A paper describes a structure:
In this study, we evaluated the Gatan Alpine detector, designed for operation at 100 and 200 keV. In addition to collections with a standard apoferritin sample, we also tested the performance of the Gatan Alpine detector on the LKB1-STRADα-MO25α complex (referred to hereafter as the LKB1 complex), which is considerably smaller (115 kDa) and asymmetric. Additionally, we obtained 3.2 Å resolution reconstruction of a 115 kDa asymmetric LKB1-STRADα-MO25α protein complex collected using Gatan Alpine on a TFS Glacios at 120 keV, demonstrating the applicability of this detector to more challenging biological samples.
Notably, the LKB1 sample was resolved to a higher resolution at 120 keV than at 200 keV (~ 3.2 Å vs. ~ 3.4 Å, respectively), with the local resolution ranges and Q-score metrics following similar trends as the FSC resolutions. To compare Gatan Alpine’s performance to the best imaging setup available to us, we also imaged the LKB1 complex with a TFS Titan Krios G2 at 300 keV with a BioQuantum energy filter and a K3 camera. Again, we started with a comparable initial number of particles for image processing and reached a similar final particle stack size. This yielded a reconstruction at 2.86 Å which was the highest resolution reconstruction out of all LKB1 complex datasets. Overall, the global conformation is similar to the crystal structure even though no nucleotide was added during sample preparation and we observed an apo LKB1 and an ADP-bound STRADα. Additionally, we were able to build some previously unresolved flexible loops and also observed some missing regions of the heterotrimeric complex in comparison to the crystal structure. Specifically, no density was observed for the STRADα Trp-Glu-Phe motif within the MO25α hydrophobic pocket although it was present in the construct and has been previously observed in both of the crystal structures. This motif is known to be required for MO25α recognition and binding in the absence of LKB1. Another region not resolved in our structure as compared to the crystal structure was the C-terminus of STRADα (residues 401–414). This may be due to the fact that it packs against the next molecule in the asymmetric unit in the crystal, packing not available in single-particle cryo-EM. Additionally, we resolved a more complete LKB1 C-terminal flanking tail (residues 311–347) at the LKB1-STRADα interface, resulting in novel interactions with STRADα.
Residue numbers in the entry:
A (entry chain B): 60 to 305, 342 to 401
B (entry chain C): 41 to 347
C (entry chain A): 9 to 336
The structure:
């Protein structure tokens, strides 16, 4: 289906989230020509500097270069009065963070985390093959549909490793507009020195996200950013909270999940496995049923938006 | 040893000293971005010829220039009680002179020298299109980022042309004596400003490729007597394509001396140069011997315990 | 293993099967798979692999057979027939061969100066949403070379950009504006020579962008006008543009726009009309008729913008210049 680039075709119904600096509003909407429900993301461009407007245009280039089952498809993009409007299909369970903040406050089940992280690593394996570094892999950027499909969505943050036609070994750009992302960034991104970073930096953010889905709170949550930088630089690695690691302590995760989170979060980037190597890891071999059969049942306490 | 906060910035250790004051590393405590700060004691500025006017001019220019090859000003902060000013700048790893001092022949391979010269000419064409004459082009005023991008830095000596003047005519002799053209050494009343920067970029290309200077003298008078004669030599290991470019730059009469157009059109500029030798690396940190030149802020974070 | 001459002949013939598709899908799927496989086989010759770098003899044979066969014209013409990942491979092949050098020569720029239709077929691709993003990537690499930028600027087809920067699909319209800005700003002497000889036609179209009902078209077009007028290569354009009473009447309307950004960009162009020595009498008649209104307005204009010291010097200089005007 094709969506018209005119502001009259969409009935905005309710607010489902906010983003960018504090400038983006995310709305559930109805597309009048068919009655299909969609997400509309709106940013007022009069609030944006010329650097911010240029940063928003880069997301629209990258979201056209990718076509993968586990990356969010963009349906339309247009200007209405002062506002940049972006349209997507609507993910009925919200983000993986919205589930934690509403129905899984003490952390998710290990099998539900396996289905989610397999879908995230399948999207990263495509993006890393295209010659890009995703930045901001976090539980807010993972979205779940009513039929249990998992989508990665942080595309504003992406950087190309291709320069003058050559794929570079490492890159040195410090991520712009990233204050809300600093806990999930790796030590070699924050160091800003002559080493640079590469695609192994996302394998750290998958380990931080795995801890966030399992524990229900992010590592380094209450810290000022300078204390969290100090703990990253002194080498403090976060891990799963269960009866082997120490009110909610009446559980264990499998040794496979403990080993997965320790293959991520390594200090040396070259010792981290690639996204295609992690999809072979023994943690995922507990998945037996189809994702679209299992995930809606693993989420049984939740009500999907319909 | 102990943390100090200046606005949102945490003070780190010394990166060097400039023409007007100390340069230090700083951390933005909100965004964790790594920066440099130039510290200007107002007590010292009024001891230097026009120093307070040069600092004011340098700030007014840096607020309105935006290019990939020119240094970026981030903030200006004041401390009127202690009589200090701080300019917060983009971080660069070292100057081009610190690399040249780090090898025994004091030169770069032709493949590496060509890669910096193309970035210098991209930055000069921007500055000239904006009407800025940078009177002090030399390896000491060219800075390298961690990504290997070159930045033209010290705008304090520069002159800005009036918007309605039809040509780049300049009056005033300024900047480093060893990089100035015969028009300055002969003490002329008027000269083309853009053709001064082509000479200083010519002495720069001669130096970084050859490891020598075209003109020398024991003091300013002997140096300007030797520049005023206009006569110099090019060594026998210098290739014919480069030797011709170093004669179109370094030309005695400003009308015969190359423009940016004739430099970009030259055979040595448009050729592709093979990596026939290993490039000169950015040298390790001078005190700690750290090869990556990592942040000095960690013992200051361990004093502050966050914030 | 297959040669470049085999791979060029394979891709030529499989494209010639896709060109018609009179036979049923059982042949079209095979032809589509052949086009995909041979585009990867070409890209492996140009970009190599991590254990086996590009070999200069294979690149020389491939680049010559792509001139001999006419296949560069065919892949650009028939780009709609190729699948999603294959269309990105055509852009990655094309840009690498366009950067080829033989000493000081660029032999692919020497090639495209005959069969110039490659440049116009890439420019036409903005009218086709399923290929516009790849055509835009290939076209921006062409205009890095001054002969190819010159063919586009000096053509009747250039004036299509005034439609492409106003399209309702914003990810295409903003890619068309990026290509439009690069043609006007990259080659300084070529752009100045064009803007003199085509002044009366170019500024008669450009005033329609300053009247646009799209906010982002209006905002980006007024930003670029200030950057074209302040550039010292354009001094003869600038002094002619500021000599026209219609151009001042527009800038005094844009100072009253509802957007703070449009007002602030208009001030930086309006400044240049009043700061001018040797004004023509139509400009003096306009400013003398508006003298009190301008002094009262400039005394109130964005006084909350207190962080900028040179903005306050320019406002002070303009209020003085408007007080110092002499009656006829
Ligand atoms: N298509 C969608 N379907 C459902 N929820 C969405 C969708 N897009 C965004 N959201 C919700 O909006 C929030 C903010 O969007 P996000 O893309 O994360 O903004 P930002 O990156 O600017 O911070 C998400 O974390 C999620 O709660």
């Amino acid at each position: 289906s094709s969506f018209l680039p005119e502001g009259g075709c969409y009935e905005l119904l309710t607010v489902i989230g906010k983003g960018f600096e504090d400038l983006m509003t995310v709305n559930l909407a109805r597309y009048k020509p068919t009655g299909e429900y969609v997400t509309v993301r709106r940013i007022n461009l009069e609030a944006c500097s010329n650097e911010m407007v240029t940063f928003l245009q880069g997301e629209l280039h990258v979201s056209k270069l990718f076509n993968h089952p586990n990356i969010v498809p963009y349906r339309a993009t247009f200007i209405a009065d002062n506002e940049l409007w972006v349209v997507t299909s609507f993910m009925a369970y919200g983000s993986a963070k919205d589930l934690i903040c509403t129905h899984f406050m003490d952390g998710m089940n290990e099998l539900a985390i396996a289905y989610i992280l397999q879908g995230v690593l399948k999207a990263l394996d495509y993006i890393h093959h295209m010659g890009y570094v995703h930045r901001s892999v976090k539980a807010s950027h993972i979205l779940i549909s009513v039929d249990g499909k998992v989508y990665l969505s942080g595309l504003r943050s992406n950087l190309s490793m291709i320069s003058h036609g050559q794929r570079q070994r490492v890159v040195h750009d410090f991520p712009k507009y990233s204050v809300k992302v600093l806990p999930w960034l790796s030590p070699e991104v924050l160091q800003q020195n002559l080493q640079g970073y590469d695609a192994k930096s996302d394998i750290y953010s998958v380990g931080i996200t795995a801890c966030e889905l399992a524990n229900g709170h992010v590592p380094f949550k209450d810290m000022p950013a300078t204390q969290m930088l100090l703990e990253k630089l002194n080498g403090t690695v976060p891990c799963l909270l269960d009866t082997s690691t120490i009110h909610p302590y009446h559980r264990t995760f499998s040794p496979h999940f403990h080993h997965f989170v320790e293959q991520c979060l390594q200090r040396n980037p070259d010792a981290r496995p690639s996204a295609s190597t992690l999809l072979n890891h023994s943690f995922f071999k507990q998945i037996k049923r189809r994702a679209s059969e299992a995930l809606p049942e693993l989420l049984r306490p939740v009500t999907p938006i319909t | 040893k102990r943390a100090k906060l200046i606005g949102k910035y945490l003070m780190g250790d010394l990166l060097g000293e400039g023409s007007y004051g100390k340069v230090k590393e700083v951390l933005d405590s909100e965004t964790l971005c790594r920066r440099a700060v130039k510290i200007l004691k107002k007590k010292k500025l009024r001891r230097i010829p026009n120093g307070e006017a040069n600092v004011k001019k340098e700030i007014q220019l840096l607020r309105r220039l935006r290019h990939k090859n020119v240094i970026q000003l981030v903030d200006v902060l004041y401390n009127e009680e202690k009589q200090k000013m701080y300019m917060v700048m983009e971080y660069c790893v070292c100057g081009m002179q610190e690399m040249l001092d780090s090898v025994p022949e004091k030169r770069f391979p032709v493949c590496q020298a060509h890669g910096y010269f193309c970035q210098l000419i991209d930055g000069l064409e921007y500055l000239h299109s904006q009407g800025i004459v940078h009177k002090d082009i030399k390896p000491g005023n060219l800075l390298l980022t961690t990504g290997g991008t070159l930045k033209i830095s010290d705008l304090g000596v520069a002159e800005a042309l009036h918007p309605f003047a039809a040509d780049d005519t300049c009056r005033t002799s300024q900047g480093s004596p060893a990089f100035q053209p015969p028009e300055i050494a002969n003490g002329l009343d008027t000269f083309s400003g853009f053709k001064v920067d082509i000479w200083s970029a010519g002495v720069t290309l001669y130096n970084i490729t050859t490891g020598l200077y075209p003109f020398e003298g024991d003091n300013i008078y002997k140096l300007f007597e030797n520049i005023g004669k206009g006569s110099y030599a090019i060594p026998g290991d210098c290739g014919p394509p480069l030797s011709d470019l170093l004669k179109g730059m370094l030309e005695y009469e400003p009308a015969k001396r190359f423009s940016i157009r004739q430099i970009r059109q030259h055979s040595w500029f448009r050729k592709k140069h093979p990596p026939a030798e290993a490039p000169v690396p950015i040298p390790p940190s001078p005190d700690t011997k750290d090869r990556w030149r990592s942040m000095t802020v960690v013992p200051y974070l361990e004093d502050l315990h966050g914030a | 293993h297959k040669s470049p001459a085999d791979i060029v002949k394979n891709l030529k013939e499989s494209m010639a099967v896709l060109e018609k598709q009179d036979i049923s899908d059982k042949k079209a799927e095979k032809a589509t798979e052949e086009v995909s496989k041979n585009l990867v086989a070409m890209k492996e010759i140009l970009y190599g692999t991590n254990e086996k770098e590009p070999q200069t003899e294979a690149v020389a044979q491939l680049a010559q057979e792509l001139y001999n066969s006419g296949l560069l014209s065919t892949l650009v013409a028939d780009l709609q027939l190729i699948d999603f990942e294959g269309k990105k491979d055509v852009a990655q092949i094309f840009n690498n061969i366009l950067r080829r050098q033989i000493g000081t020569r660029t032999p692919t720029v020497e090639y495209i100066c005959t069969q110039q239709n490659i440049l116009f077929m890439l420019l036409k691709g903005y009218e086709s949403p399923e290929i516009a993003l790849n055509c835009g990537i290939m076209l921006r690499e062409c205009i890095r070379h001054e002969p190819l930028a010159k063919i586009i600027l000096w053509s009747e087809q250039f004036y299509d950009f005034f439609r492409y920067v106003e399209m309702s699909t914003f990810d295409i319209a903003s890619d068309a504006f990026a290509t439009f800005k690069d043609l006007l700003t990259r080659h300084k002497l070529l752009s100045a020579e064009f803007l003199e000889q085509h002044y009366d036609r170019f500024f008669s179209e450009y005033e329609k962008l300053l009247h646009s009902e799209n906010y982002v078209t209006k905002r980006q077009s007024l930003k670029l006008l200030g950057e074209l007028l302040l550039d010292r290569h354009n001094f003869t354009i600038m002094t002619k543009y500021i000599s026209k009473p219609e151009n001042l009447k527009l800038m005094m309307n844009l100072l009253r726009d509802k957007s703070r950004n449009i007002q602030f960009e208009a001030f930086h162009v309006f400044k240049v009309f009043v700061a001018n020595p040797n004004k023509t009498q139509p400009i003096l008649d306009i400013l003398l008729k508006n003298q009190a209104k301008l002094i009262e307005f400039l005394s109130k204009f964005q006084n909350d913008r207190t962080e900028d010291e040179q903005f306050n010097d320019e406002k002070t200089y303009l209020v003085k210049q408007i007080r110092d005007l002499k009656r006829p």
